[model samples]
Target: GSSGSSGLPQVEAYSPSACSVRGGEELVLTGSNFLPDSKVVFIERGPDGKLQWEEEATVNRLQSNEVTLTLTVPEYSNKRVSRPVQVYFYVSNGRRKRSPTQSFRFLPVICKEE
Candidate 1:
């Protein structure tokens, strides 16, 4: 019994599910019921289940097909915590309404020296 344009969106999964811990990567999302104002958000939770970090991704749907959406991964909150961090992301209708969350991982930077 919805009477508004605030219909919920469905996000299947994102391509290249994992990215560098430094972030700033492009992720393609495939979902339905996405509006022009639809956006993706990334979140990081603390060990105690507290919200540590959260940021809205830069949405892009005008480049290619409407069936697919795109977003730029935001940089991690703590640059020092270079360990692999798992994050959850979801689609938003710009009204606090969010779709089912999906899991993503950020790989740590490794360098070898002689």
Candidate 2:
């Protein structure tokens, strides 16, 4: 097996396949090659229908595996839109390496009665 370097970060899995909230959407990530100073990169489509990238602080528990990452879902908007939005994942060490991208969907919030 290849002894991967510590500089590279990887993300194998993330919990809560369906995300629908402004923020504080708990996410648990499972993978190898995690660094303490790394940040989770999220890829989303902008209103102009183009790819946009965003980063969030990785929030994890006390005792860690060095293979798991926890993150608070960033607010995509002040409110939801009519259609569902697709979000992608990435791991960054703020260097040359970044994990592969994967797509996930988060539905828009349905407005309540006023």
Candidate 3:
């Protein structure tokens, strides 16, 4: 017999790892114990705790596997820096049922010379 805990839902890694600040990209979230309605929440730091930006990603469950979820990266605030910004994300199954946060990078859109 082996029983003590089953373990909470967790996200181990992400595909691409980084995306543009304008967003609208898809990221494959890989891990374990993800529910059908689980959500990926992105959090950004604020200025003196006075302003914060947080958004829930659009989750897609096309595969029959519960270990992977497709997340559509959301657009970040334009008020933020134009440089690479590091953000955190976590899987949320329910109220207070959140997994350990992971780091992600948001890059500025590249412009081409005309």
Candidate 4:
């Protein structure tokens, strides 16, 4: 016989430890042990500790151990700088758990000389 505690899901890994994408580009977040029918929050913060942008993913049905989210990066006037980003996974069923804070740096797209 197996216990329910042994069935509890746990996060294994997240791809792309660091992402360097241009503004308005779509960023994809992939991971495992993601609760089914959950909402994932993609938050970005500026140097001043202000929330610059946030996006959410809607899971209609139960998901497998793996999940992915594609979001468009918002545009900002400030120069590209390292910003803090966090992904929160909110589960609807069973015990709720949140993923660790994943931070990455944003680099401005290089311009070509005319």
Q: Pick by lDDT: which candidate is best?
A: 3
lDDT of each: 0.72, 0.68, 0.75, 0.44
The worst-scoring run of ten residues by lDDT in candidate 3 lies at: 105-114
Each candidate structure's TM-score, on Cα atoms with residue i matched to residue i, is 0.77, 0.74, 0.81, 0.43
Which residue ranges in model 3 land beyond 4 Å of their true spot?
1-3, 79-81, 112-114
TM-score of 3: 0.81
Residue range 20-97, candidate 3, lDDT tens digits: 787787788878888887877788887676536678777677852578888788888762555778877777787767
Q: Write the per-residue lDDT of candidate 1 for residues 1-114, one digit (tens) a residue.
A: 677655677776678878876677778887667777776777888879687566766766675245677878888776555478888877767667678888888777764112
Candidate 1 off by > 4 Å: 1-6, 94-97, 112-114
Candidates ranked by TM-score: 3, 1, 2, 4
* lDDT (C-alpha) at residue 53 in model 3: 66
* Top of the candidates by TM-score: 3
Best of the two (2, 4) by TM-score: 2
Query: What are the root-mean-square deviations of the candidates from the true structure over C-alphas?
Result: 3.9, 3.6, 2.9, 5.9
Pairs with steric clashes in candidate 1: none
lDDT, candidate 3, equals 0.75
Stretches > 4 Å off in candidate 4: 1-11, 21-31, 47-52, 57-96, 112-114
Q: Would you list the rank order by lDDT, best first?
A: 3, 1, 2, 4
